[PDB]
Amino acid sequence: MYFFSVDPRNGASKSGDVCGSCCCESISARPGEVNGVMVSYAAWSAPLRGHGLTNKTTFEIDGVSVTPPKVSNAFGRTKVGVVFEGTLSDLFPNPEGEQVEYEISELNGPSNGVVELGANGAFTYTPGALFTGVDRFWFSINGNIGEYVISVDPTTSELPQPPFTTPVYVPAARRSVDPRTHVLKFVLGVSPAAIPGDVYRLTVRQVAIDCDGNEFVHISCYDISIGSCG
């Protein structure tokens, strides 16, 4: 669990443990983890005597280094209960000539089905009986990881098309704030498709509220660094 004490905006700042080398503070993440982050606004909002914080935090993710992925993603569709079949070879257009070591990680496999990897880029997704929804599994075509998303339709018409989870994401509603102590919590999720070495930047806009209902906005940034081995 990461912890960060936000600068108080006093004209006097730069608390003890500071490694001058940037502006945005650092966060190290490993592809696959889903960790939890804390931020203590006590230093900035406690002097601003009022109703403390509010649940109007706003996050944004932009990448300062991408290194575009090698293998594309894909989408699959099938009705409820009916076995699905698909190919995994048109998803790795390689510039050079080399074999295709298809592999399915037992750690990032499906959650409501089973998959049998064939001999050449073929696989059988037999969805779970009495189940309808969206299900994924993370293949690895010769090292480059991508996700294959499948939606099993409840036999009536169809299901929508989900948005292909990003490398780094902050979940929709898993944050909270304790106005009694001015402490923010949220979750920081890293897809298994992130490439070790890249760096993503997370901006957090937190808004306090005075005794009457006006606003005190606060902006801070963080540099998430996708590094392998923790």
Next chain:
Amino acid sequence: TYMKIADYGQLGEYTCDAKCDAEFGEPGNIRHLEGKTYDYRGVFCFNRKNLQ
């Protein structure tokens, strides 16, 4: 003249720790009222013989 309690009003609610916003609340009205009364006032007349 009578009186009509319009409403009662709220009284500041349930603060666990002092934030000092709803101190006095707001009270209601009493709305003094009034009202008069009316009357008919008709007449009629016969002469003496068409009545006798």
